[PDB]
Structure 1
């Protein structure tokens, strides 16, 4: 059922950029772009929670051709226009320090993508990944813990769950469970897809909860900047109580570093009922109900 590797690096699909739109609003940090590609003329199909590869042009410093980078798919299987014709990505421009020689260093594939023009041809591979798949059970609870571009798979889940046009297109999936996104970014301008996330929460107050951790605007109880692990600690008992349900799935996505504090929070919660979280979690992973993708 799951589409996998319909296109591979040795013979990628050549798609065309339809649009490239900014997601970070004025006064935010960095550049994150929503990029939609045309899939017509090929047979690339995919589902929610999967990734694709992009092969950027050029050679590396050693003269060798650049190889693919993976990006989490940001659209449902139907694409943003629910026409089964496109696929979208949520790409942050990588840039960084002077202890990497030069001045500011700009990531190759992410700079290429964030600056790409509509009409341009792009080498696409995939789809890949079976670890971040959403349950078909419309009564499942879904916890989503995201930072930055880790919002991408969460967008594919929530759009499938909650968009009117998705609901009309997916007779078999009429979501009635409970989902909770805890989303960590540095500023309110940096809240990717803010308007649509808040619209969903307003329409579906009983089925969707939205919690932000905004580091430049909020302090945790210790006086430090607010991060996602702080919000998970604050809501550790609530989150553990949901995780106890046989039908609950949890998804963690974003740059690596989030897991240690999330585990410590849930470990203190579970310990109150005589449960060792690390062992309970191993069983959840084995059951396919604890999903992690960090990078």
Structure 2
């Protein structure tokens, strides 16, 4: 059955925490664990980082933590590094179900010369490698939490939530789905439909697949899960299989759900949004509908939730 979580007082706040810690005085959190999420054929390393905040930096699902990596700002001598934001991949209780930890899902940014393929560690991403190189006991300067765009609308516990992720964009949805399905949260009993679409390069690049597959077996009437493996599958037009192509496969169901009030969420690569928009326009056209008019209504009705970069 559902996993006991504590403390229940994390359900009491009526508003999300915001900017509890600020860059000039971050919270010094401690790494609990860092593990790779991916297999040897993944094009890059993505890691799962568990951070002990001690209950000092609570958050709601869908929010981000800021991390200030060590060092000086290259563009401002004497200044600390800029905050990098990471979407929290855990529920407010965290992976130890105790309200003391939060988790990040971090892609290592690695630079390769476009011509030679030669790696250049000096051009790698500072914070992502800092995080995935961390070890238990290391300290992390945390700020935030921040963000409200991806907060989960809970007013209707039987709402439909269609979640579209590319890569580490799956982060908030891991938290949504644990709250919907895994954790014993007496004041939020989800009875709607949650539908996760996840795009990753190949099978070795899947993130949390065992967890999501378990929900299909535990909640077959409330959870659907579709994957687009870009380098293992091709779309109807001959391009790599992206999430927009999986959305197209279920266009009639998705449009009906949206017309019925479903929320739809997009997280991950900013580059996926033009492709999604093009696909949805084409689907609407085939149905004799205007996508522009539909999207305007979804935005007016607060059904459309995008956080990409």
What residue in structure 2 maps to residue 107 of structure 1?
Answer: 125
What residue in structure 1 maps to residue 209 of structure 2?
Answer: 194
Supply the distance in 1 between the matched residues of 2:284 and 2:234 (Cα, whole angstroms): 25
| 1:282 paired to 2:296 | yes
In structure 1, which of residues 123, 144, 149 is the aligned counterpart of residue 141 of structure 2? Answer: 123
Aligned pairs (5 A) from 1:4-15: 4-15=18-29
SS in structure 2 of the partner of residue 196 of structure 1: helix
What residue in structure 2 maps to residue 264 of structure 1?
Answer: 278
Relative to structure 1, the CA distance from residue 130 to residue 100 in structure 2 (aligned partners, 3 Å threshold; closer, same or farther) is: farther
Q: Which stretch shows the higher mean deviation, 21-30 or 65-74?
A: 21-30
What residue in structure 2 maps to residue 73 of structure 1?
Answer: 88
Tell me if the contact between 1:236 and 1:265 (Cα under 8 Å) persists in the aligned partners: no
Tell me if the contact between 2:73 and 2:82 (Cα under 8 Å) persists in the aligned partners: no
TM-score by length of 1: 0.93
Tell me if the contact between 1:75 and 1:87 (Cα under 8 Å) persists in the aligned partners: yes
CA deviation after TM superposition for structure 1 residue 285, in Å = 2.1
CA deviation after TM superposition for structure 1 residue 215, in Å = 1.4
> 1:27-54 deviations in whole A, cap 9, x for unaligned?
22211111111111x6211101000100
SS in structure 1 of the partner of residue 205 of structure 2: coil
- Give the paired residue count: 289
Supply the distance in 2 between the matched residues of 1:266 and 1:123 (Cα, whole angstroms): 41
| 1:57 paired to 2:70 | yes
Aligned pairs (5 A) from 1:36-185: 36-40=50-54, 43-62=56-75, 63=77, 64-98=79-113, 103-104=119-120, 105-136=123-154, 137-163=156-182, 166=183, 168=184, 170-185=185-200
> 1:91-129 deviations in whole A, cap 9, x for unaligned?
010012326998433100101001011101110001101
In structure 1, which of residues 241, 246, 250 is the aligned counterpart of residue 264 of structure 2? Answer: 250
SS in structure 1 of the partner of residue 65 of structure 2: strand
CA deviation after TM superposition for structure 1 residue 194, in Å = 0.9
Supply the distance in 2 between the matched residues of 1:100 and 1:70 (Cα, whole angstroms): 31
TM-score by length of 2: 0.89
Q: Which stretch shows the higher mean deviation, 214-223 or 141-150?
A: 214-223
| 1:216 paired to 2:217 | no
- Structure 2 gaps of 5+ residues are 1-14
Supply the distance in 2 between the matched residues of 1:123 and 1:65 (Cα, whole angstroms): 11
Q: What's the C-alpha RMSD, in Å, of the aligned pairs?
A: 1.8
In structure 1, which of residues 2, 21, 28 is the aligned counterpart of residue 42 of structure 2? Answer: 28
